[PDB]
Amino acid sequence: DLRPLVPLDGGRFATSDLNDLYRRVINRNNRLKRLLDLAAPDIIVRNEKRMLQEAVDALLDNGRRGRAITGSNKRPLKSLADMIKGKQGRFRQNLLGKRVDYSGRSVITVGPYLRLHQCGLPKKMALELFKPFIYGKLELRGLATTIK
Amino acid sequence: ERMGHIELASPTAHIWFLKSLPSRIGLLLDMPLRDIERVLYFESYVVIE
């Protein structure tokens, strides 16, 4: 569930590239076992061990190898260390600053009728940001029988 | 949470501990990284005692 394969509408699928990189490595490893089982000439096992080394190296970083093995489309695969490093990795993006519930957005205006400590706020935006508090206040106030 | 593993039929070097520059494999043998690359890709044999 961290390299998901969620289904998309109409039968397409959305996979993460870690799935493709793992499948590459497993294919090449099983083929290497199938080669050692038949005891091929050392040329072929040497090539296969090179291929496995490259596959694991790409699964680890997908850099360091001149031409990072692109996906089906001609784009490079986001490797595992491309889920850590950089402005798009977990560190700078999903750990330090997160998308946050209880938060709206809207154009601002001037409103010079306001004391300094108070801000105008649309009825609809407060009714949305403040839904749980309203459910609690209603239920405790007996207006609403139950939460639904 | 669960994490399967993979028993590689052959060992294979960790790219992080090899191309971090300083190459940790490289100087942990005190051996230049060009020669490690000659050994890893089967281009040059290396003696082990």
Binding site: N47, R50, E54, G66 | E37, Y41, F42, E43
Partner: peptide, 11 residues
């Protein structure tokens, strides 16, 4: 005799 490369198809 050659310099180097990685390109496992090359080797």
């Amino acid at each position: 005799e050659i310099g180097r490369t990685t390109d496992p198809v090359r080797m």
